Amino acid sequence: DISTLPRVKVDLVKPPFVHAHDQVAKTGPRVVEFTMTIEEKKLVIDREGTEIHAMTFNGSVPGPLMVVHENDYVELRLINPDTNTLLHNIDFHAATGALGGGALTQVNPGEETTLRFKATKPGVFVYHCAPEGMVPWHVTSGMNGAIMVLPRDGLKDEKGQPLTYDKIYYVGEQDFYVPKDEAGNYKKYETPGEAYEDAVKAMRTLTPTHIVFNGAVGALTGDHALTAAVGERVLVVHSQANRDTRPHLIGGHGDYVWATGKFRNPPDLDQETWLIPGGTAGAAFYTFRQPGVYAYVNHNLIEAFELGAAGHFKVTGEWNDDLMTSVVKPASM
Amino acid sequence: DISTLPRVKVDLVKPPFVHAHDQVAKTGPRVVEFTMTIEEKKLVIDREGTEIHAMTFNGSVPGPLMVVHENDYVELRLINPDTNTLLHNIDFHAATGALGGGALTQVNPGEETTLRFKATKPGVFVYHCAPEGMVPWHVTSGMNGAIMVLPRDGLKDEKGQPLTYDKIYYVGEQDFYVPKDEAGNYKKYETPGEAYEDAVKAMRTLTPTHIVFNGAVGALTGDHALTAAVGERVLVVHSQANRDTRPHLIGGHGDYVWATGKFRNPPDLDQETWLIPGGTAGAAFYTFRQPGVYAYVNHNLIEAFELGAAGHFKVTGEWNDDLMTSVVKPASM
Amino acid sequence: DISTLPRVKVDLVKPPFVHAHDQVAKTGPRVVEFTMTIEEKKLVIDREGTEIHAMTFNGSVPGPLMVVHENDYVELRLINPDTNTLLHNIDFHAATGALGGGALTQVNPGEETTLRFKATKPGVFVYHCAPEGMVPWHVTSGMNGAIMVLPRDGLKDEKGQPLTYDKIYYVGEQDFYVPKDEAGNYKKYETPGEAYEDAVKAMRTLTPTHIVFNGAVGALTGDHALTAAVGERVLVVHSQANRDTRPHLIGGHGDYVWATGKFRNPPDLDQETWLIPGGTAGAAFYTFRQPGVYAYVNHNLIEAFELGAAGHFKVTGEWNDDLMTSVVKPASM
Ligand SMILES: O=N[O-]
Ligand SMILES: O=N[O-]
Ligand SMILES: O=N[O-]
Ligand SMILES: [Cu+2]
Ligand SMILES: [Cu+2]
Ligand SMILES: [Cu+2]
Ligand SMILES: [Cu+2]
Ligand SMILES: [Cu+2]
Ligand SMILES: [Cu+2]
């Protein structure tokens, strides 16, 4: 009986960071309350200044990672302010019934709604907008995120022993399909509604114009590179709501990978590259062993280095020459 | 010695339905006799009235699901009537030797042949036409199906306990490559032979014009929606003979999934979305827990909702508010 | 302390053959020395005489398979002769740190370098060139190979029992993106540097013009078909450095498959087709049971039979009618 359960309000954070949570549950089942505000806005997605009308949960692409435990109840208040122009909803792949909540959450501009569902299956799962007749348009305009449902006793390895992460990051990868004129130049529009027919034509080519992490080319580089120290155990959650991807840590591995993201399955070990199907969230666990810069990419290297699907880690600590060393530096011969 | 084995004649049914069979074998090994008649015909594949010359086993796209047990013998009589125009054959991925039977089954119009093979490996497997020099053309014109080889003691979960399905459906997903004129309009032809050179050009773009379940856009909707009741255990067999797909039940899960379709492997649990590689059949087991409409899609959502890869389930029974409920219905605020 | 370890010099062989090695290690850990010479050269890749400027390790596409054991040290001397025009390096997905060795191996024409790394994870792994700013161009011009790191006690099945192969072949699959003029004819260039801007445009379509095994259409056919005898256990290593593939043995199976190529995981059994993600090497084990011709393909059949991703096995021995037989040969009805 849900009225006797504890309620807890969580304030979400912007990706690639993740709100505070316990790996091993320190309470019994709870009702976990989240609020998300839909925001349609202009977004500059590349170094050339290409602009789209993005459709976001909570102002970001991707939307923020929600974290609960198995058999918690998720209660989401979804707000569509009247500064928006479109009807939106939300589908949780984590949930059972009513098109993942999509049938119960249709909100016009000026409306709100509150949905509750029980998190019966552990794993990372995609959530995305899915309004009838306009599903791929909303999703490929950035309206997707993920939710992690941890087992109550946390993550386990292939032998059933505990795996504890020191840091967690969320990487949302987004395929965009920006419309082009006859010559190949990107088109610009005053409103999202304007772009609609051109967007359908662009999607139907099945060829994205950009593929990005965290909403833009170069978003997870420089000042915004992911950080870690040698010896730290890092969990990287990665989602793609529409299209296959194949993540890879350049200079590293996935020590433990749930490529299709469901924790009741044992992880795959020692992965170089793993396939996350479109419409799925996956998770990879790695212990850093060397300092320096690492790139984290989609290993279709055209998608990575030409279309934008590349981010960086900056890792501090001590170099281990046993693992790798330059015996003779590049020289004439 | 095969002459002392029981023979049983099976009459095939049209997909998405599956002929009657026992999960757990009630007899020893048998010779299972099937007959299939090749039919080239015109097919209307979308709501706009686009027509192709389909190449079918038994008049349907996909061809019908055949069901046997491990170490049964399959004996297929394949008939190519003289109303057809092309040479056809059959390749079973279930079989060992002679290009899956392809080298032994080449039939001109007016010919027939009978092939026998032993079903030595359990799983769901693709079968498809594969005539020398024209393999992708026949396959992408609809000439493919699947065969299920059940273990003699039926399906088992990841712990080795029995999994029994109440209903089974077969979803054949088909990529078509309809040729286009300069402006983007679909071309029409009087005979299959006419389309050949244009078809090669269309295939080489690697970009399907349509992707459909059961031979047409909207085929598994409305009156032809798949049905189930809350509490029923449903097995969905899904094949794609040429191109990757990523099925997903909107509002549900794959409780037990054999994504690459081979039952000696333990299933993957609690899948949201799973990848079936091109040239493979997969299978997903689900117990319905909520009533209502569910969509079953390829979760590249452009492929689903723009190109045609979407079907429906209509599920009857009682709503369970513990799993999901609307706490505050959409309203102003 | 590495100076007390045995050193062994290995001479590499051209794919699809693999240098001599022991499955089960007959020595303790060693430093295994390899030398590779970079060669930029013209390559004819199809039956029409289309030419590209290939960038190769050791003169071949793919580069040669290197074979070591877990916890051996790999010492690679990489030579870039001054007859080349470009800067090259090497990234081993097998290695830990410095972008897989990429940051430590940048060699201009006229330079050499020697890298050492410890092979801490067992599996097959891709290696590829990855120079800063030009990663996909070098990779999709053929500059990739694989390295196998065997467990010290060799391969094991899903029950932990030994699997011993009689033959091993390496199939490198390569996506090429040859630039086209307005009409669709392939362009020719005097130097690699000439093609650069046209190549970027071609890659950005995400649509390969050719997909080949061992560097050319038809390379593994005829005189160059792979061979085996009925009863032999064959390991096929397959890599794709940039793009997904889905291998399939026509008339056979993958009895034991490590689709993502990492031997600490149990194999998948009885696969018809398996997905190797771009940026991965996989391995399939099969025991031949029937003689004759088999085709080994990427089972996107357009990619196989139109774009080039098809090779042959020629298998000798005795036909087994229990497994398959023609009951009634094709005849009028
Ligand atoms: O090793 N990364 O492309
Ligand atoms: O949740 N289906 O797109
Ligand atoms: O059965 N091979 O396409
Ligand atoms: Cu929306
Ligand atoms: Cu979805
Ligand atoms: Cu045919
Ligand atoms: Cu096939
Ligand atoms: Cu290079
Ligand atoms: Cu790489």
Numbering used by the authors:
A (entry chain A), B (entry chain A), C (entry chain A): 8 to 340
What did the study's authors say about this model?
We describe the approach with a detailed case study of MSS experiments on microcrystals of copper nitrite reductase from Achromobacter cycloclastes (AcNiR). Here, we describe the development of a modified MSOX approach applied to microcrystals at RT. This approach is no longer multiple structures from one crystal, but multiple serial structures from many crystals (MSS). We also describe a practical approach to separating polymorphs within a population of microcrystals and obtaining separate structures of each form, leading to two separate MSS series collected from a single batch of crystals.
A total of 20 successive images of 20 ms exposure each were measured at each aperture position of a chip, providing 20 room-temperature data sets at different dose points. Indexing of individual diffraction patterns (stills) from the first image measured from each AcNiR microcrystal revealed a bimodal distribution of unit-cell parameters. As a consequence, images were binned into two groups above and below a mid-peak cutoff of 97.25 Å, which we henceforth refer to as AcNiR-big (a = b = c = 97.75 Å) and AcNiR-small (a = b = c = 96.38 Å). Separation of the unit-cell polymorphs led to an improvement in data quality, suggesting that this analysis step is beneficial over simply merging all data regardless of unit-cell parameter. Refinement of the structure arising from each polymorph revealed two different structures, as shown in Fig. 4. The AcNiR-big and AcNiR-small structures were superimposable with an r.m.s.d. of 0.16 Å. The subsequent fall in diffracting power follows an exponential decay, with a somewhat faster fall-off with dose for the AcNiR-small population than the AcNiR-big population. The half-doses for the two polymorphs were 55 and 75 kGy, respectively. The AcNiR-small population rapidly decreases, with a concomitant increase in the population of AcNiR-big. The resulting decrease in multiplicity significantly impacts the resolution to which acceptable merging statistics are obtained. While not conclusive, this could suggest that expansion of the small cell acts as a trigger or seed leading to subsequent polymorph swapping.
